[PDB]
């Protein structure tokens, strides 16, 4: 699933509130 994979990358960046 594209969105799930993209999110995994961005969670690692940790640039916006969770």
């Amino acid at each position: 699933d594209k969105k799930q994979k993209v999110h995994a990358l961005f969670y690692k960046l940790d640039i916006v509130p969770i």
């Epitope: 969105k3 993209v6 990358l9 960046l13 940790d14 640039i15 916006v16 509130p17």
Partner: antibody
């Protein structure tokens, strides 16, 4: 009603230093990641750096090589870029931009008006 | 670095939709955005998350991403749509990358 007003451009010699400023208003600044992007006159857009909503994590383009530093003041709604050891190829209009896509990818949804940085002997 | 290949110049003929492509290895695994920059203006976000439009962007602007190709399409082309269009995504360590930009000429 978002606004991003920049200042701090001008002329600087090779090897010199300059600090850019980006004043934000019209949105909760401290909840958003923020970018700098640059554009050499008559050329294309080139990303510079991004900083996290509360300022911990910072990431930079390959050419920065530790010479630039992105920072923010969430109590004054200010974003900064300190540029050191500048080179002729760093001449460009520098924009600040709000992030609005993350975590669903990048999306620079609002851009400041831009200020020109000229590096010249 | 990464990639993002854009044709530097595109022309659209009277009555046709405009089509602007953006290719990169693995691009379909990433989300593409598109920025419009009119002369002397700052860039404006027109597409994000491959296909989505910010509020105030007309629906005649559409975006897609499949395989290695992201595409911006403009129906109901007007002379006011002449601008430079930049696609963007990210490289191998999730750093923002822009395409070279495409200058759109509206013929006729």
């Amino acid at each position: 009603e978002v606004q991003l007003v920049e200042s701090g451009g001008g002329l600087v010699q090779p090897g010199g230093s300059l600090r850019l400023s980006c004043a934000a208003s019209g949105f909760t600044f401290s909840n958003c990641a923020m970018h700098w992007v640059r554009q050499a006159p008559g050329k294309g857009l080139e990303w510079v750096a991004v900083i996290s909503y509360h300022g911990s994590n910072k990431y930079y383009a390959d050419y920065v090589k530790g010479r630039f530093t992105i920072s923010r003041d969430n109590s004054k709604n200010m974003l900064y870029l300190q540029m050191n050891n500048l080179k002729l190829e760093d001449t460009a209009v520098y924009y600040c931009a709000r992030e609005g896509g993350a975590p669903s990818g990048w999306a620079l949804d609002y851009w400041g008006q831009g200020v020109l940085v000229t590096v010249s002997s | 670095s990464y990639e993002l290949t854009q044709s530097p110049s595109v022309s659209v003929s009277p009555g046709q939709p405009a089509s602007i492509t953006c290719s990169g290895d693995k691009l379909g695994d990433k989300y593409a955005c598109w920025y419009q920059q009119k002369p002397g203006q700052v860039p404006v976000l027109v597409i994000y998350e491959d296909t989505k439009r910010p509020s105030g962007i007309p629906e005649r602007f559409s975006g897609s991403n499949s395989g290695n190709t992201a595409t911006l399409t403009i129906s109901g082309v007007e002379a006011g749509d002449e601008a430079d269009y930049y696609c963007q995504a990210w490289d191998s360590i999730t750093h923002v990358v822009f395409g070279g930009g495409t200058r759109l000429t509206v013929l006729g």
